[PDB]
Design brief:
Length: 373
């Protein structure tokens, strides 16, 4: 696993990617790591934002599946043609597998100018693959075709980080690993049982936190919350930070807030705790996130007399999304073999006053199931 450490790169706010090769002879591409979807897809024709792309006609091992595919995400969409080819991860396990690949031929608001990645690795389950669940996802192929154990973990550092395939690297975290069940195998779906802001409970029925599912998604930046939960959370964050007033556009994630370089007032912003269902009845643990995680710096030389930030919590109409802002400075273990997700504090986490945490146990008397439907 040391060979896999620091195998992820990224531009701030533009996506974490791993190097892969596709085809025979190997064509090198940088591929976005996405636990929020299940299609492996690569740019396969010119695009103003791509420095390189998959050339199927140079690969003797390419097999055309004679089927088109269209994938509309929350942000962005693409379409292209299915086939299969040999794939390897130079800084992953030492194996070469034959995998499904979508050759993207048209796209809209999907590739990002300057992001350095040319494709996406959907690491979730076949139930949400397009065009349907018969298209085996990459990680499934890898496990079936090799001896790699059925689990991977991600340490995203807010850029670089590590994707450890087939295991857990103890150098990447401290303290204990706490596990929450994967509720259903489609997305990495989990259940939040409680939310607090500065230790104050939001006080809603816990099904609202999971309306109509809650997922762990490395392919989305923000923590995204159902409308009712989002409005409650903003109200409580505004209340805690009320010594300064910000425009509504800031709270809507449409406008930056800036402070003279070095003077960001971290202390006025609250910590947010998300309590995740535990492995034992009515037990939970919490992960705590600091404003350094949910106020995302926007690098722009033009504004660089200041430190400028966007509010990285937003409203969702498709359930909770624990995006990269939540994953950053946790080590997150996708323990597919045991149908659970592990969290620990990451070696790449804080202030001289507060530190992000993963801790438990917490018990609740309330017998409600927090799962939505
Ligand atoms: C609002 C928003 C949504 C999404 C991405 C971003 C922003 C974004 O800004 N992402 C960038 C990034 C930067 C820094 C860190 C992490 C990500 C770069 C990543 C692009 C890849 O997009 C991946 C996609 C992810 O699969 C979504 N999962 C739920 C889902 C919803 C609908 C359909 C489907 C499947 C089943 C087809 C899944 N993310 C976004 O939609």
């Amino acid at each position: 696993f040391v060979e896999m450490v620091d195998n992820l790169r990224g531009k701030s706010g533009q996506g974490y990617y791993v190097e892969m090769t596709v085809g025979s002879p190997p064509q090198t591409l940088n591929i976005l790591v996405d636990t929020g979807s299940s299609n492996f897809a690569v740019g396969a024709a010119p695009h103003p934002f791509l420095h390189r792309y998959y050339q199927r006609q140079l690969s003797s091992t390419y097999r055309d599946l004679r089927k088109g595919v269209y994938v509309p995400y929350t942000q962005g969409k693409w379409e292209g043609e299915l086939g299969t080819d040999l794939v390897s991860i130079p800084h992953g396990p030492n194996v070469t597998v034959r995998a499904n690949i979508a050759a993207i031929t048209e796209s809209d608001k999907f590739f990002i100018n300057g992001s350095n990645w040319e494709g996406i690795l959907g690491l979730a389950y076949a139930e949400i693959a397009r065009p349907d669940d018969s298209l085996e996802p990459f990680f499934d192929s890898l496990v079936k075709q090799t001896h790699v154990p059925n689990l991977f973990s991600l340490q995203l550092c807010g850029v670089g980080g590590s994707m450890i395939i087939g295991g857990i690297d103890h150098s990447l975290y401290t303290g204990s690993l706490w596990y929450t069940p994967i509720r259903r195998e489609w997305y990495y779906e989990v259940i939040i049982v409680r939310v607090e802001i500065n230790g104050q409970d939001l006080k809603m029925d816990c099904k609202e936190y999971n309306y109509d599912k809650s997922i762990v998604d490395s392919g989305t930046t923000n923590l995204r919350l159902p409308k009712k939960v989002f409005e409650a959370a903003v109200k409580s964050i505004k209340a805690a930070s009320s010594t300064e007033k910000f425009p509504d556009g800031f709270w809507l994630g449409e406008q930056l807030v800036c402070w003279q370089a070095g003077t960001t007032p971290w202390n006025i912003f609250p910590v947010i705790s998300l309590y995740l269902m535990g492995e034992v009845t009515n037990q939970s643990f919490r992960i705590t996130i600091l404003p350094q995680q949910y106020l995302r710096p926007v690098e722009d030389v033009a504004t660089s007399q200041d430190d400028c930030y966007k509010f990285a919590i937003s409203q969702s109409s498709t359930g909770t999304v624990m995006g990269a802002v939540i994953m950053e400075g946790f080590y997150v273990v996708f323990d597919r073999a045991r149908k659970r997700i592990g969290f620990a504090v990451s070696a790449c986490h804080h202030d001289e006053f507060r530190t992000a945490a993963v801790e438990g146990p917490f018990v609740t008397l309330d017998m409600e199931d927090c799962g939505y439907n």
